[model samples]
Target: GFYIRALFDYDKTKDCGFLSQALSFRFGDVLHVIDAGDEEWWQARRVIGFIPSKRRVERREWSRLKAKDWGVLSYETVTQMEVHYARPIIILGPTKDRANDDLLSEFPDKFGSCVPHTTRRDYHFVSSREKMEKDIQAHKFIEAGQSHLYGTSVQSVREVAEQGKHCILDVSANAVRRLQAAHLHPIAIFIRPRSLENVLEINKRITEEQARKAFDRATKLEQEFTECFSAIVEGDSFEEIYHKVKRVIEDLSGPYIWVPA
Candidate 1:
């Protein structure tokens, strides 16, 4: 039994673009066909062998898959492949005050982050309109044919968390609806600023009025979602907040139960 492992360069956007277009069988570095029915296996070989383009560069790349015959195995037949995968630990914040980004950067090995596709072009790591369309197509393909693969829209941070285990999602209150729908009981930690004055004290670039507005917004989010959170950590310093969060996660003892996938 073999598992299909998809590999691509994270630094290169072209790699991501290629994968999202369902060009994996042709261009993917590591290729395999898992749990394919007899007809599907036959189709897989045909697809793997055929080159879709006449362009020299792509044709040379496409020809690589012909070198090996990928095997297929069923989930039921392969007991090891049927094991449950872990989900991620999500972290939500009111605003982008650099706290969430700093926390994620602090523990890069512990968490995996994703950039959501948005119509607006404000963020550097977002999907363009063309890329977004390709993503939708890829998602549909995964849903219809590859049930083993994970595919869900990034409507909420919870959906992103569902993709990988032990991830810290830096999202806002917009995640509440999906979190409720998914019935995922997460240890929500709300980090509030000490005060408006303290915000101004720390960030000298922002005006006092800007600091007050930001503080007001953060407090509003905290207040509105108070019932949903497990702990509220207040601090002016990032170090203090980081320690509090670390402690909270470590001290969480659980009689955990099985939740639906």
Candidate 2:
């Protein structure tokens, strides 16, 4: 796995098109950028705000439901959140703030920082109208995707695990609906803590009674997730896996799970 810090170059002269334009040039790459400051700017440009939300920022894991193969691990920054995609090296955008640099500096060996590609019109820019039309036409494609947003670093992994915080991968709402249609609960859901510190505080509060409840839910959820994953990996059927996993989520209501595909 590779880690990185990334940032966007705010040049008003160049057409600041959609975020996908920025992402296109760096497809199949990993990056890291800190905090989401201008959501309105992105929204005005027709970029989906929730696609790379703040919840995604603090968590280290990226939901793995999108990729064809989950064997590799890499992280990137889309809008506000860090994303985990399968890649070989770290590609960082320039960090505009000191805090982001400080965070990246803490783990030098595994992380490398870089700026966005600068070639003239080197990136792919997709218009909002075009994106929406494409999406509407290819709703099935959208249903079978996951995040590039990553939250945690290698150093934070053990820390998160020690606190009993598990990461979950993301699944599409349409996917869930599909699962529900089959009368099965989603077996796997993806979520994560805000940070290592957040993970620690959360687990520390699990009292004896809460611990029992939490564990019970976790066991059930894990089983469901396994069942869902098996349906994908072993059975080779997205529809069957979707339903079995949806049922599990309905059964376990408390605490979220995180995953990075």
Candidate 3:
């Protein structure tokens, strides 16, 4: 089988880097740990997952990164993993036959202009540390029940539903906007990414009938949103499309909605 370069993310607080490095060194695969605080010795944990099938070292040892952390992790994972997909992570120029610029532009949408063009020693050095910090704080705020707000634009949630994918349901307005723009639909459910405890509390307040009503209403709204989103993407009238999208939110009474665990 051809080798695949996979990227795994671990919590910095836990001994992730050590474990990851150990695995890399032992398996002859490369590992890149996002070590901002410079904690060493993550390599020691590699023995914990000697076998790939049994490799849940990070999951078992580390806590779930706040949704914000997950976002950063996701971005890092995608970029690093892309190296395995088509091009090398550190391609300064092409081989004898191929021009460097042509090879670099192969996946512009995924890598972006600065990525292949950068003189930075390693492309893996790029970090989403700031975005991760913001995401984590925003996740914490929502978990605290202070920010019931969701979505950056009126079409945001509708667009998510249109794509038939689940939203990350984090606290960042920009992430939500980006998710919509990317057309990766998120299932419409509004719970703070950090609010696992609140999920139980809110669920307790609902009767069976209330739950049914909420689900039915949500389903209807989602259906309407998807239909309108399809029209908008197809170049429908801007004013009519805006009103259709706005109606989805205006119909809702609460700032946040609950979903099943």
TM-score per candidate: 0.45, 0.19, 0.17
Lowest summed lDDT across 10 adjacent residues in model 2 is found at 87-96
User: Relative to the true structure, how large is the alpha-carbon lDDT of every model?
Assistant: 0.44, 0.29, 0.27
Best candidate according to lDDT: 1
- Could you give candidate 1's per-residue lDDT for residues 53-105 as a string of tens digits? 22333344456655554821111111111212223344444333454566578
At residue 86, candidate 1 shows an lDDT of 28
Higher-scoring candidate on lDDT, 1 or 2: 1
Which model, 2 or 3, shows the larger lDDT? Answer: 2
Candidate 3 TM-score versus the reference? 0.17
Winner by TM-score between candidate 3 and candidate 2: 2
Model 3: how far residue 244 lies from native, Å: 26
Write the candidate numbers in order of decreasing lDDT: 1, 2, 3
| TM-score: model 1 vs. ground truth | 0.45
